[PDB]
Amino acid sequence: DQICIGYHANNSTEQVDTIMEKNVTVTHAQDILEKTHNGKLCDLNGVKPLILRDCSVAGWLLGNPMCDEFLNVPEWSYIVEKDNPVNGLCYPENFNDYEELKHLLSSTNHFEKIRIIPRSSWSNHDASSGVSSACPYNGRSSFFRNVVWLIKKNNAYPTIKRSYNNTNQEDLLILWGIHHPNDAAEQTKLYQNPTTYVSVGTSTLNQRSVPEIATRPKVNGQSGRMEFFWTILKPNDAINFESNGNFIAPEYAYKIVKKGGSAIMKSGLEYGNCNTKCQTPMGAINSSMPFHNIHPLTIGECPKYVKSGRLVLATGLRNVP
């Protein structure tokens, strides 16, 4: 007659690692590493993202004619831009503090567009000839839609003096620019006055830009260049513009809604008509696992990211036949 003490055993094939020994087969284990995603870009808790497709953030904000899809985008959860969107600055040039503006976007969920300076408000200047073959639309020369490339009228460019007061509750993102002609002859043909500038002033901003008339290689058929600026006009503050030429004046600006909590995700995927609580640039994640090794740049309620290929915890004991 006997009584023996013993331990469980099964047909488990699960394996775990330890410092002194690898691949120890155990009776029970627990995988804690999520390794799959759905390969799509979904809505984040019901809110759809802003998929810029072939337009860059600048193409969208300035109003590149090829970006009409985003003239009035609604509230978004996160933003997706491609690595190299073809539609950005149709007329060649530079966008000042572009990366800082993009970073600012990353902390907002909505840009409501409003008209701060009617295009019909320019009575002593040509506000219709400001176009270029570099920004085509419906087979003809056009231009960024949110700003105005002002031209001289009746062989004159009387000095401009415009002021705008932010009577809204939200911070206002204002964009404007200046044109750098290719030579003196061009300066005279477009603005008449040879020596010009664009001065802008708010309670905090002080600036005066001058055109740098030079000749350069052709980009999108143009050897001229546009230089764009931006500032945030606080509620109740006013912005003053003065210029005797080369001014690319604002028309539309954006009211900023800091519902705060966004991100500019780099991806070539399009919208996958799905909903998730955790999104990576490669696809969504839906799991209870504490960890995941999909991608490090995620948004929403997600598992912790690690580079591990395998992460299994032992729960049961060593499985001995």
Next chain:
Amino acid sequence: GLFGAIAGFIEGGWQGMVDGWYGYHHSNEQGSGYAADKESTQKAIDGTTNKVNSIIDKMNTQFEAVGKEFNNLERRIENLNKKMEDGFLDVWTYNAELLVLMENERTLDFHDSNVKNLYDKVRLQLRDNAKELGNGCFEFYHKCDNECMESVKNGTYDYP
């Protein structure tokens, strides 16, 4: 194992005991059979469950990468940014992997210790009334039946 029981003085496991992690296998007149020890088994289950939860909860403040862009003349800060984010990802990946490795080892020794202590508890019970075969089994001198067997597991076993 560290406590020498599992795959030790008790050479193998019992495929026939599906009632738990540790238990007994008796043999008398009436018959034989396996019976998992619910006390120690459950005590182990609670311990492992708390361990898994602790591990997870301790990995709730890990670093989180944030997307930023830099222009052509900001290569130094872009690299500083990249080295920093990779830096923390490598640290937490190390933390996750090492913690699992170390605890997995402790989990195996934990089970080993439980078996060893269950065995020793029984050994103390069957003071001089049983013979230690040294294989995890005890052979009684004078016959012992199902009521007697249940007595040991009952933890009530005692001449008193």
